[PDB]
Design a binder for this molecule. Structure first.
Ligand SMILES: CCOC(=O)/C=C/c1ccc(N)cc1
Ligand SMILES: CCOC(=O)/C=C\c1ccc(N)cc1
Ligand SMILES: [Mn+2]
Ligand SMILES: [Mn+2]
Lengths: 137, 137
């Protein structure tokens, strides 16, 4: 069967600024780069940045809610979010509708998130404060 | 410090066909559903389906290369691909890289992939046959 996410590939319009964002600003590990892409890791996540002439820099009001959340500890969350804010990283959402999260944009407008907590923790929180119509299996 | 992918959220135009696709066709575990979304798991992956009226059913020629690859074993790959083909799931690309890959579309045109092989395997192949301009770190 399927066993998890093998990799996340993000199309990017400008390779070097995207590599810098994920490696320098977000702290991910850069393993290789080439004329048309890069490979990074974030823990066990394999991230591929793929140079794509079709990628547009997309304002958050023009894209749907598809987004990518990265795990961070409770101890590190607030100072990492504040650093992104002080660095001028654009945002796309303010209301914490799914727990402790910080919503921010990459250089092309990919919707990213810092989140504290697992799926099990989110299910437990939702039992007390469920989303409208929620059922648990 | 970021420690991995926390969750992947896909915006969906119609919740019931997307739940059918990810749970029934792709075999993911459904943990909860509410009036505007669902939570599933696939191994370590926490997947959220978020009902979003801004999601367009998007032809693959009209989206960029951003895509989401799921892990499967080599032994299971061909029968899972045949299952998707029997269900009429569209393919958006042929495989031309190392490691088996099947490139298929979700009901809203999200670009998905089945892939066999790790980042380490890809890096080993690249060190033997580097892409144009490739540098390692
Ligand atoms: C199309 C370019 O392809 C490459 O692999 C370039 C890599 C690179 C890495 C670090 C630099 N300071 C400059 C260039
Ligand atoms: C596109 C990459 O931009 C940056 O890296 C900019 C600033 C920065 C400053 C302090 C940090 N701890 C990390 C990053
Ligand atoms: Mn999220
Ligand atoms: Mn891929």
């Amino acid at each position: 069967m399927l066993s998890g996410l093998n990799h996340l590939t993000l199309a990017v319009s400008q390779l070097a600024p995207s590599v810098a964002f994920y490696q320098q600003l977000l702290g991910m590990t850069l393993h290789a780069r080439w004329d048309s892409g890069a490979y990074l890791s974030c823990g066990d996540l394999w991230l591929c940045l793929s140079l794509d002439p079709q990628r547009r820099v997309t304002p958050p009001e023009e894209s749907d809610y598809t987004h990518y959340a990265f795990s961070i500890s409770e101890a590190d969350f607030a100072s990492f979010a504040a650093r992104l804010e002080a660095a001028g990283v654009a945002v796309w959402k303010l209301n914490r509708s799914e727990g402790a999260s910080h919503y921010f944009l990459d250089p092309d407008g990919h919707k990213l998130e810092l989140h504290v907590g697992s799926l099990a923790q989110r299910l437990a929180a939702c039992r007390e404060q469920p989303y409208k119509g929620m059922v648990f299996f």
